[PDB]
Short mmCIF file of C-alpha atoms and ligand atoms in Angstrom, two decimals:
data_model
loop_
_atom_site.label_atom_id
_atom_site.label_comp_id
_atom_site.label_asym_id
_atom_site.label_seq_id
_atom_site.Cartn_x
_atom_site.Cartn_y
_atom_site.Cartn_z
CA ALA A 10 -35.69 40.86 44.04
CA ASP A 11 -33.75 44.18 44.59
CA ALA A 12 -34.78 47.86 44.65
CA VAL A 13 -31.44 49.73 44.48
CA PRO A 14 -31.46 52.52 41.81
CA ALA A 15 -29.48 52.09 38.57
CA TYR A 16 -26.28 54.22 38.39
CA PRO A 17 -25.74 56.20 36.24
CA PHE A 18 -29.08 57.82 37.27
CA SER A 19 -29.68 59.38 33.82
CA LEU A 20 -28.02 59.86 30.36
CA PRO A 21 -25.91 63.04 30.69
CA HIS A 22 -26.64 66.46 29.10
CA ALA A 23 -23.58 68.63 28.23
CA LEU A 24 -21.61 69.25 31.48
CA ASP A 25 -24.88 69.44 33.50
CA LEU A 26 -24.99 67.53 36.85
CA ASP A 27 -28.02 65.28 37.58
CA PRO A 28 -29.72 67.00 40.58
CA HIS A 29 -29.88 63.70 42.61
CA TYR A 30 -26.19 64.41 43.58
CA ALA A 31 -27.06 67.62 45.55
CA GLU A 32 -30.06 65.69 47.08
CA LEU A 33 -27.74 62.72 47.95
CA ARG A 34 -25.08 65.07 49.49
CA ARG A 35 -27.68 66.65 51.89
CA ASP A 36 -29.83 63.58 52.79
CA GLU A 37 -27.96 60.28 51.86
CA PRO A 38 -24.27 61.03 51.00
CA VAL A 39 -23.48 57.23 50.97
CA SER A 40 -26.26 55.28 49.07
CA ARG A 41 -26.44 51.78 47.39
CA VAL A 42 -26.54 51.58 43.52
CA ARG A 43 -26.55 48.98 40.69
CA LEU A 44 -23.66 49.72 38.28
CA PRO A 45 -24.24 48.88 34.58
CA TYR A 46 -21.82 45.83 34.54
CA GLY A 47 -20.64 43.23 37.13
CA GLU A 48 -22.89 41.53 39.77
CA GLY A 49 -24.55 43.09 42.82
CA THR A 50 -24.51 46.50 44.51
CA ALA A 51 -21.91 49.26 45.38
CA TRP A 52 -21.93 52.33 47.70
CA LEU A 53 -22.01 55.58 45.66
CA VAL A 54 -19.92 58.28 47.51
CA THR A 55 -20.91 61.96 46.72
CA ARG A 56 -19.24 64.11 49.52
CA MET A 57 -15.49 65.13 49.61
CA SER A 58 -14.65 63.83 53.19
CA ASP A 59 -15.81 60.29 52.18
CA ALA A 60 -14.27 60.48 48.63
CA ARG A 61 -10.84 61.13 50.29
CA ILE A 62 -11.28 57.97 52.51
CA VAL A 63 -12.26 55.70 49.55
CA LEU A 64 -9.39 57.10 47.37
CA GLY A 65 -6.93 57.64 50.33
CA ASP A 66 -7.18 54.66 52.72
CA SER A 67 -5.13 51.41 52.24
CA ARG A 68 -8.25 49.38 53.31
CA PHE A 69 -9.82 50.30 49.91
CA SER A 70 -8.26 48.05 47.19
CA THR A 71 -8.51 48.56 43.37
CA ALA A 72 -6.63 45.22 42.72
CA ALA A 73 -9.68 43.50 44.34
CA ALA A 74 -12.04 45.09 41.78
CA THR A 75 -10.40 42.98 38.93
CA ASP A 76 -12.87 40.14 39.76
CA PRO A 77 -15.44 40.01 36.89
CA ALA A 78 -18.34 39.83 39.45
CA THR A 79 -17.28 43.23 40.97
CA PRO A 80 -19.55 46.11 39.87
CA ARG A 81 -17.94 48.47 37.28
CA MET A 82 -18.97 51.42 34.98
CA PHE A 83 -17.49 49.87 31.83
CA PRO A 84 -18.22 46.67 29.83
CA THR A 85 -14.81 44.83 30.00
CA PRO A 86 -13.66 43.38 33.35
CA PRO A 87 -10.59 45.46 34.30
CA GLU A 88 -6.97 44.56 33.30
CA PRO A 89 -5.10 43.27 36.41
CA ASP A 90 -1.74 44.56 34.95
CA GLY A 91 -3.32 48.04 34.64
CA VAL A 92 -2.04 50.84 36.99
CA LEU A 93 -5.55 51.57 38.40
CA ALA A 94 -5.78 47.83 39.44
CA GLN A 95 -2.51 47.85 41.50
CA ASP A 96 -2.52 48.50 45.31
CA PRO A 97 0.66 49.86 46.98
CA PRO A 98 3.34 48.93 47.44
CA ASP A 99 3.29 47.19 43.97
CA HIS A 100 1.55 50.34 42.63
CA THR A 101 4.43 52.49 43.98
CA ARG A 102 7.08 50.38 42.10
CA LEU A 103 5.00 50.63 38.84
CA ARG A 104 4.43 54.44 39.25
CA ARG A 105 8.25 54.75 39.70
CA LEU A 106 8.87 53.22 36.19
CA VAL A 107 7.67 56.47 34.59
CA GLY A 108 7.12 58.94 37.49
CA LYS A 109 10.31 61.05 36.94
CA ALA A 110 8.96 62.32 33.57
CA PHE A 111 5.71 63.86 35.06
CA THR A 112 7.09 65.71 38.18
CA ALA A 113 5.96 69.39 38.27
CA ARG A 114 9.70 70.33 37.68
CA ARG A 115 10.13 68.39 34.37
CA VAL A 116 6.60 69.30 33.13
CA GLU A 117 7.46 73.01 33.68
CA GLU A 118 10.60 72.39 31.49
CA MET A 119 8.07 71.67 28.63
CA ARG A 120 6.23 75.07 28.76
CA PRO A 121 8.39 76.40 25.83
CA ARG A 122 7.99 73.43 23.34
CA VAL A 123 4.28 73.24 24.33
CA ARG A 124 3.78 77.05 23.89
CA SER A 125 5.47 77.23 20.41
CA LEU A 126 3.28 74.21 19.37
CA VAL A 127 -0.05 75.71 20.58
CA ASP A 128 1.11 78.88 18.74
CA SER A 129 1.86 76.97 15.48
CA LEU A 130 -1.65 75.27 15.48
CA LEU A 131 -3.44 78.61 16.24
CA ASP A 132 -1.54 79.85 13.06
CA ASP A 133 -2.94 77.03 10.83
CA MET A 134 -6.40 77.98 12.30
CA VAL A 135 -6.02 81.69 11.17
CA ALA A 136 -4.66 80.48 7.76
CA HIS A 137 -8.01 78.60 7.25
CA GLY A 138 -9.77 81.75 8.65
CA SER A 139 -13.06 82.17 10.62
CA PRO A 140 -15.27 80.32 11.08
CA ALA A 141 -13.32 77.08 11.92
CA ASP A 142 -13.64 73.96 14.14
CA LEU A 143 -11.64 74.42 17.41
CA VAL A 144 -11.56 70.56 17.77
CA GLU A 145 -9.95 70.07 14.32
CA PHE A 146 -7.36 72.90 14.67
CA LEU A 147 -6.43 72.85 18.44
CA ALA A 148 -8.29 70.35 20.71
CA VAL A 149 -7.10 67.06 19.03
CA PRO A 150 -3.74 67.95 17.34
CA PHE A 151 -2.15 69.74 20.41
CA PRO A 152 -2.51 67.06 23.18
CA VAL A 153 -1.79 64.35 20.52
CA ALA A 154 1.47 66.13 19.48
CA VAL A 155 2.66 66.54 23.13
CA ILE A 156 1.98 62.92 24.27
CA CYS A 157 3.62 61.53 21.05
CA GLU A 158 6.87 63.55 21.52
CA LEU A 159 6.78 62.67 25.30
CA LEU A 160 6.11 58.94 24.78
CA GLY A 161 7.97 58.62 21.43
CA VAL A 162 4.84 57.56 19.46
CA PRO A 163 4.83 58.44 15.73
CA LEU A 164 2.48 61.45 15.28
CA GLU A 165 1.40 59.62 12.04
CA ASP A 166 -0.29 56.74 13.95
CA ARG A 167 -2.77 59.29 15.44
CA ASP A 168 -5.89 57.85 13.67
CA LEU A 169 -4.80 54.32 14.76
CA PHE A 170 -4.41 55.00 18.53
CA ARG A 171 -7.26 57.60 18.60
CA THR A 172 -9.55 54.76 17.24
CA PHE A 173 -8.14 52.32 19.88
CA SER A 174 -8.58 54.96 22.63
CA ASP A 175 -12.23 56.04 21.90
CA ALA A 176 -13.17 52.29 22.05
CA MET A 177 -11.46 51.68 25.44
CA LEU A 178 -13.19 54.81 26.98
CA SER A 179 -16.58 53.22 26.04
CA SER A 180 -19.43 53.04 28.66
CA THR A 181 -22.51 51.98 26.61
CA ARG A 182 -21.31 52.66 22.96
CA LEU A 183 -19.42 49.35 22.38
CA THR A 184 -19.87 45.81 23.83
CA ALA A 185 -17.47 43.68 25.96
CA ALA A 186 -16.18 41.81 22.83
CA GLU A 187 -15.83 44.92 20.56
CA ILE A 188 -13.65 46.34 23.44
CA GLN A 189 -11.58 43.20 24.41
CA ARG A 190 -10.70 42.93 20.63
CA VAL A 191 -9.37 46.56 20.59
CA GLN A 192 -7.42 45.93 23.88
CA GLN A 193 -5.44 43.01 22.34
CA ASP A 194 -4.60 45.10 19.22
CA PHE A 195 -3.47 48.05 21.48
CA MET A 196 -1.41 45.65 23.76
CA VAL A 197 0.27 44.13 20.63
CA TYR A 198 0.76 47.57 18.91
CA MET A 199 2.28 49.12 22.09
CA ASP A 200 4.27 45.88 22.70
CA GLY A 201 5.57 46.32 19.10
CA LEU A 202 6.58 49.99 19.70
CA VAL A 203 8.78 49.10 22.79
CA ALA A 204 10.52 46.18 20.93
CA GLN A 205 11.57 48.64 18.09
CA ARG A 206 13.93 49.88 20.90
CA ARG A 207 15.60 46.45 21.66
CA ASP A 208 18.92 47.16 19.83
CA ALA A 209 18.24 50.96 19.29
CA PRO A 210 17.12 52.73 22.53
CA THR A 211 15.47 56.23 22.57
CA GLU A 212 15.39 59.26 24.99
CA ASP A 213 11.61 59.02 25.66
CA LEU A 214 9.27 57.08 27.99
CA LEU A 215 8.97 54.18 25.49
CA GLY A 216 12.80 54.01 25.87
CA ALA A 217 12.41 53.79 29.71
CA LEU A 218 9.71 51.09 29.18
CA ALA A 219 12.04 49.11 26.81
CA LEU A 220 14.91 49.33 29.39
CA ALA A 221 12.60 48.08 32.22
CA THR A 222 11.84 44.97 30.00
CA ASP A 223 15.28 43.21 30.57
CA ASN A 224 16.75 45.45 33.41
CA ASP A 225 13.94 45.15 36.08
CA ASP A 226 13.27 41.66 37.62
CA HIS A 227 10.26 42.85 39.77
CA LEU A 228 8.09 44.45 36.95
CA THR A 229 6.24 42.18 34.40
CA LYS A 230 5.89 42.85 30.60
CA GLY A 231 2.07 43.06 31.11
CA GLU A 232 2.57 45.88 33.68
CA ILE A 233 5.26 47.74 31.61
CA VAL A 234 3.39 47.51 28.23
CA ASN A 235 0.01 48.43 29.84
CA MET A 236 1.73 51.59 31.22
CA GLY A 237 2.54 52.60 27.59
CA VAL A 238 -1.14 52.09 26.59
CA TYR A 239 -2.73 53.85 29.67
CA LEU A 240 -0.36 56.86 29.41
CA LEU A 241 -1.12 57.07 25.64
CA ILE A 242 -4.98 56.87 26.10
CA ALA A 243 -5.09 59.15 29.17
CA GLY A 244 -2.36 61.49 27.79
CA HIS A 245 -4.57 62.79 24.93
CA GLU A 246 -8.23 61.73 25.67
CA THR A 247 -8.43 63.78 28.94
CA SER A 248 -6.83 67.02 27.59
CA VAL A 249 -8.62 66.93 24.16
CA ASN A 250 -12.08 66.68 25.79
CA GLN A 251 -11.05 68.98 28.66
CA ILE A 252 -9.99 71.87 26.29
CA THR A 253 -13.44 71.69 24.52
CA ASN A 254 -15.21 71.72 27.96
CA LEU A 255 -13.24 74.76 29.28
CA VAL A 256 -13.87 76.69 26.03
CA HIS A 257 -17.58 75.67 26.22
CA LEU A 258 -17.97 76.94 29.83
CA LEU A 259 -16.24 80.26 28.92
CA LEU A 260 -18.11 81.10 25.64
CA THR A 261 -21.66 80.11 26.84
CA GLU A 262 -21.55 82.81 29.57
CA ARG A 263 -19.10 85.00 27.48
CA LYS A 264 -18.67 87.10 30.71
CA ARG A 265 -16.17 84.40 31.83
CA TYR A 266 -14.04 84.54 28.63
CA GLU A 267 -14.03 88.40 28.92
CA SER A 268 -12.71 88.17 32.55
CA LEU A 269 -9.73 86.11 31.22
CA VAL A 270 -9.21 88.52 28.23
CA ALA A 271 -8.68 91.40 30.73
CA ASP A 272 -6.26 89.38 32.98
CA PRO A 273 -4.55 86.40 31.26
CA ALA A 274 -2.94 85.70 34.71
CA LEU A 275 -6.39 84.53 36.06
CA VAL A 276 -6.07 81.60 33.50
CA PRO A 277 -4.28 79.20 35.96
CA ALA A 278 -6.86 79.75 38.77
CA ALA A 279 -9.81 79.51 36.28
CA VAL A 280 -8.38 76.19 34.90
CA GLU A 281 -8.33 74.92 38.56
CA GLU A 282 -11.92 76.26 39.06
CA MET A 283 -13.16 74.82 35.73
CA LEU A 284 -11.32 71.56 36.60
CA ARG A 285 -13.51 71.50 39.79
CA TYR A 286 -16.75 72.51 37.94
CA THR A 287 -16.53 70.07 34.95
CA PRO A 288 -17.66 66.42 35.21
CA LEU A 289 -14.92 65.23 32.75
CA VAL A 290 -15.62 61.76 34.22
CA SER A 291 -19.33 61.38 33.22
CA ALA A 292 -20.20 59.17 36.23
CA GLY A 293 -18.59 56.84 38.75
CA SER A 294 -14.93 55.88 39.05
CA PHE A 295 -12.64 52.85 38.95
CA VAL A 296 -14.22 50.90 41.87
CA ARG A 297 -12.55 50.28 45.30
CA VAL A 298 -13.42 47.19 47.48
CA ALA A 299 -13.08 47.38 51.33
CA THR A 300 -10.64 44.72 52.70
CA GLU A 301 -11.60 45.64 56.34
CA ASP A 302 -14.71 47.42 57.78
CA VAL A 303 -14.19 51.23 57.10
CA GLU A 304 -16.12 54.16 58.70
CA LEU A 305 -17.45 56.77 56.16
CA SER A 306 -19.69 59.73 57.37
CA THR A 307 -23.03 57.86 57.67
CA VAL A 308 -22.15 54.13 57.19
CA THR A 309 -19.50 51.50 58.07
CA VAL A 310 -18.59 50.00 54.63
CA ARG A 311 -17.95 46.25 55.35
CA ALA A 312 -14.99 44.10 54.13
CA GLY A 313 -15.99 42.96 50.56
CA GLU A 314 -18.43 45.86 49.86
CA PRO A 315 -17.54 47.82 46.70
CA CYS A 316 -17.64 51.63 46.64
CA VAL A 317 -17.48 54.09 43.73
CA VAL A 318 -16.90 57.92 43.92
CA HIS A 319 -18.35 60.71 41.73
CA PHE A 320 -15.43 63.25 41.45
CA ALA A 321 -17.71 66.08 40.14
CA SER A 322 -20.15 65.69 43.13
CA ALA A 323 -17.32 65.90 45.75
CA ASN A 324 -16.26 69.04 43.76
CA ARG A 325 -19.74 70.58 44.53
CA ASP A 326 -19.76 69.80 48.33
CA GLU A 327 -21.13 73.09 49.93
CA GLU A 328 -19.35 72.17 53.25
CA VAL A 329 -15.96 72.51 51.38
CA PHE A 330 -16.59 75.26 48.72
CA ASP A 331 -18.57 78.52 49.26
CA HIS A 332 -21.35 78.77 46.53
CA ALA A 333 -20.28 75.44 44.89
CA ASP A 334 -23.10 75.61 42.21
CA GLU A 335 -21.40 78.83 40.82
CA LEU A 336 -18.14 79.33 38.74
CA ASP A 337 -15.80 81.79 40.63
CA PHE A 338 -12.15 82.44 39.44
CA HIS A 339 -11.30 84.45 42.64
CA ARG A 340 -11.75 81.60 45.21
CA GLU A 341 -8.94 81.86 47.83
CA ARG A 342 -9.11 78.05 48.43
CA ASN A 343 -9.94 75.33 45.81
CA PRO A 344 -8.99 71.86 47.23
CA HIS A 345 -10.72 70.01 44.33
CA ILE A 346 -10.20 66.26 43.44
CA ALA A 347 -10.67 66.69 39.64
CA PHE A 348 -7.27 64.80 39.46
CA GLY A 349 -8.31 62.23 42.10
CA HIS A 350 -6.58 61.62 45.45
CA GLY A 351 -4.25 59.15 47.21
CA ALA A 352 -2.17 56.42 45.53
CA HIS A 353 -3.93 56.76 42.12
CA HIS A 354 -3.82 60.64 41.96
CA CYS A 355 -3.42 61.62 38.26
CA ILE A 356 0.20 61.06 37.12
CA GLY A 357 -0.44 63.65 34.33
CA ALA A 358 -1.84 66.23 36.81
CA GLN A 359 0.95 68.73 36.05
CA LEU A 360 1.05 68.03 32.26
CA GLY A 361 -2.77 68.49 31.91
CA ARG A 362 -2.59 71.74 33.96
CA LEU A 363 0.21 72.97 31.64
CA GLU A 364 -1.66 71.80 28.43
CA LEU A 365 -4.90 73.63 29.45
CA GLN A 366 -3.02 76.74 30.71
CA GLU A 367 -1.09 77.23 27.43
CA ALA A 368 -4.23 76.44 25.30
CA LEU A 369 -6.44 79.02 27.14
CA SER A 370 -3.78 81.80 27.57
CA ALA A 371 -3.08 81.58 23.77
CA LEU A 372 -6.83 81.77 22.87
CA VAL A 373 -7.53 84.58 25.42
CA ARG A 374 -4.58 86.73 24.14
CA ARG A 375 -4.73 86.25 20.32
CA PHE A 376 -8.58 85.98 19.89
CA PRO A 377 -10.45 88.54 22.08
CA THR A 378 -13.40 88.24 19.60
CA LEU A 379 -13.93 84.43 20.09
CA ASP A 380 -17.62 83.29 20.15
CA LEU A 381 -19.44 80.01 19.38
CA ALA A 382 -20.55 79.93 15.67
CA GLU A 383 -23.06 77.02 16.00
CA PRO A 384 -26.17 76.82 18.27
CA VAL A 385 -25.80 75.60 21.95
CA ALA A 386 -28.68 73.09 21.18
CA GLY A 387 -27.07 71.35 18.11
CA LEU A 388 -23.69 70.75 19.94
CA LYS A 389 -22.40 67.20 19.17
CA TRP A 390 -21.41 66.02 22.72
CA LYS A 391 -19.71 62.54 22.68
CA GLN A 392 -22.24 59.85 23.85
CA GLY A 393 -21.78 56.42 25.54
CA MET A 394 -18.21 57.12 26.76
CA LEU A 395 -16.97 57.22 30.42
CA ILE A 396 -15.76 60.86 29.73
CA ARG A 397 -17.68 63.94 28.36
CA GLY A 398 -16.60 66.48 25.69
CA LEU A 399 -17.59 67.91 22.23
CA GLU A 400 -16.83 66.15 18.86
CA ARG A 401 -16.77 69.58 17.13
CA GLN A 402 -16.69 73.19 18.48
CA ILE A 403 -17.07 75.57 15.46
CA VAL A 404 -15.76 79.05 16.54
CA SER A 405 -15.74 82.56 14.92
CA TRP A 406 -13.37 85.54 15.60
C1 HEM B 501 -7.22 67.79 32.34
C2 HEM B 501 -6.47 66.74 32.39
C3 HEM B 501 -6.80 65.61 33.25
C4 HEM B 501 -7.81 65.31 34.15
C5 HEM B 501 -9.00 66.14 34.53
C6 HEM B 501 -7.57 64.02 34.65
C7 HEM B 501 -8.34 63.34 35.63
C8 HEM B 501 -7.95 62.18 36.29
C9 HEM B 501 -8.50 61.57 37.47
C10 HEM B 501 -9.71 62.02 38.23
C11 HEM B 501 -7.79 60.44 37.80
C12 HEM B 501 -7.99 59.49 39.01
C13 HEM B 501 -8.58 58.09 38.78
C14 HEM B 501 -8.89 57.20 40.02
O1 HEM B 501 -8.16 57.09 41.04
O2 HEM B 501 -9.95 56.51 40.00
C15 HEM B 501 -6.76 60.41 36.84
C16 HEM B 501 -5.84 59.43 36.83
C17 HEM B 501 -4.92 59.37 35.80
N1 HEM B 501 -4.57 60.38 34.92
FE1 HEM B 501 -5.54 61.85 34.48
N2 HEM B 501 -6.45 63.63 34.08
C18 HEM B 501 -5.91 64.48 33.25
C19 HEM B 501 -4.76 64.42 32.46
C20 HEM B 501 -3.94 63.32 32.32
C21 HEM B 501 -2.82 63.16 31.48
C22 HEM B 501 -2.25 64.22 30.59
C23 HEM B 501 -2.35 61.86 31.67
C24 HEM B 501 -1.16 61.15 31.15
C25 HEM B 501 -0.15 61.78 30.57
C26 HEM B 501 -3.22 61.28 32.60
C27 HEM B 501 -3.06 60.02 33.06
C28 HEM B 501 -3.76 59.63 34.14
C29 HEM B 501 -3.35 58.33 34.65
C30 HEM B 501 -2.34 57.34 34.14
C31 HEM B 501 -4.07 58.14 35.71
C32 HEM B 501 -4.03 56.86 36.55
C33 HEM B 501 -2.80 56.71 37.45
C34 HEM B 501 -2.88 55.66 38.54
O3 HEM B 501 -3.66 54.67 38.47
O4 HEM B 501 -2.10 55.79 39.53
N3 HEM B 501 -4.17 62.19 32.98
N4 HEM B 501 -6.88 61.45 35.92
C1 DEB B 502 -14.92 54.62 35.36
C2 DEB B 502 -14.33 55.68 34.50
C3 DEB B 502 -12.82 55.65 34.55
O1 DEB B 502 -12.32 54.87 33.43
C4 DEB B 502 -11.67 53.72 33.69
O2 DEB B 502 -11.58 53.27 34.80
C5 DEB B 502 -11.12 53.05 32.40
C6 DEB B 502 -11.66 51.62 32.29
C7 DEB B 502 -9.58 53.11 32.29
O3 DEB B 502 -8.99 51.83 31.94
C8 DEB B 502 -9.11 54.20 31.32
C9 DEB B 502 -9.42 53.80 29.87
C10 DEB B 502 -7.62 54.54 31.53
O4 DEB B 502 -6.96 54.99 30.34
C11 DEB B 502 -7.41 55.59 32.62
C12 DEB B 502 -6.04 55.44 33.28
C13 DEB B 502 -7.66 57.02 32.13
C14 DEB B 502 -7.52 58.09 33.20
C15 DEB B 502 -7.77 59.46 32.63
C16 DEB B 502 -8.40 57.80 34.42
O5 DEB B 502 -7.97 57.19 35.37
C17 DEB B 502 -9.87 58.16 34.39
C18 DEB B 502 -10.20 59.28 35.36
C19 DEB B 502 -10.68 56.90 34.68
O6 DEB B 502 -10.46 56.43 36.01
C20 DEB B 502 -12.19 57.04 34.46
C21 DEB B 502 -12.54 57.72 33.13
#
């Protein structure tokens, strides 16, 4: 006895936006939806101004969305000791565990390591010679290397935590039980890695996490260990996919790649523009519940009513960006929310920006002749995961 549309609206194609988003933005920017898991209905938010209220305002709570009955985009009910499920000021204390490491200053200190590493992998890829798989030689091994040195994870457990991570970024691919099983193995594995540091500490985040275990009376082991897991998932899954998406946008209208080849200083502003353009999050968002009535553009969201944001739709608001439907690397202003907004703003924002910058610059400088060497129609996009990206990107040069 309800007539609210199912969200997501459709199964996704490549990085293509469902057109209902541009319709919704014009005519019904705040609309009711039935999310694929949990009970009941949620407001979908599709415009920037509203997005910033749902993400920004203290009267939207993510902790409140831990209730199993709360609508959600993913099978498992969310982990209460997860970062995304903390409201400030508890969220601020947790963010502070690890925050020092990810400041724009420290991340910039990594450009040299990160550059000599991208360089090394691009070597192995010219050893093997054209044509090769950009995913095998750059997209997976580069982000995986950086997060492992940063965290202090053994680069040799890659297949183990990659497996764990693909499962936990499941939308429709795996079931609640498949996923809760993987979670407990990850918890226990990550809990194991921090204990290795009990009588032998390390100069790496896992070190910091170990220290917080017996030297912080306000943070729980749940919270501390989950930070290891979430950093480790997010710290490679986002960048890996997001390199394949950037390369895909550039090579499909080769024009774009050629613009960067001429001026490898446009790379930073094109990363920011392609961060705006790309729906890396396939649909929805970690859900926020109103704790008090809150005024969005067209509706007062009531205390108890869930909302969910679509980052990529807010990034195509024509009130905020001139010619939003079009890729333009010479925009003067680009106030995108590809990295979210408010309390939960990406902690890796600066690292991901560095990782993409160094990946693209390198390609655009050493491989002028880079094209796709498989058809645009046969491209193996990852299916049934909360995030989009290619499983293989065979390139020629
Ligand atoms: C291109 C790279 C990346 C993109 C596009 C991206 C995108 C996003 C977005 C949109 C959010 C906001 C979620 C929300 O409030 O609902 C987010 C949060 C997050 N990002 Fe990323 N991300 C990237 C790289 C990274 C990296 C490298 C890490 C870790 C090293 C990371 C860790 C996270 C974490 C932990 C959060 C949640 C923090 C919190 O709850 O306060 N991300 N990311
Ligand atoms: C609804 C889709 C969202 O996924 C979720 O909420 C997931 C259940 C989270 O537990 C995932 C697995 C965590 O690792 C995140 C910290 C990863 C980080 C990159 C993001 O926050 C990301 C934008 C995320 O919010 C969305 C993909």
